[PDB]
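Components:
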Amino acid sequence: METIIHKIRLFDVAQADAFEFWVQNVDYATCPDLPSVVRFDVHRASLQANAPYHYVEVIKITDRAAFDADMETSTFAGLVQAFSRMAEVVEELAGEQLGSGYAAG
Amino acid sequence: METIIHKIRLFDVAQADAFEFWVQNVDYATCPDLPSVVRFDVHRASLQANAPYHYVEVIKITDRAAFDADMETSTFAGLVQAFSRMAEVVEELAGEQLGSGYAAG
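Structure:
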């Protein structure tokens, strides 16, 4: 299992509400069509205009190889096109999971 | 729901195997005793000696208030004591989740 994490900066924090609606109703809604995505969630870190980043996304994937293929689909290209009108990735963190992790009952 | 993410740097990458055994068999194993922790997992990013960080941890919590209380327990103090012999947090990212996220069937 692997995890990719992005810091996301809005070009304009006035657009937060469009961004968040897109995330919840378009970005999340498209994840069933990306076979490599096991878990995906986005988190609001800051809405200061000049923040180095406003959001963090956490993508849990089967393996990087599978995710890379999913990125080459037109399903993904449609997500990127919309994302890129509002926001940019300013850092990527990635790793391979140790063991199975913990998840509450 | 909130998420806390740490970049973790080992003082000495020779100790990776002790660190990873501790994470999987002690750190993960203690999470049932921390009521605020909903999900927890650690990820190996890099084992270059001079890397700014080697690991990333992702902590999903009910709310920051509940987590803060859990940190004041002696359960947590025992985790910190061990952690601090091997590693240091070099960055914290945190946010409030947008909606319910996506999780594969």
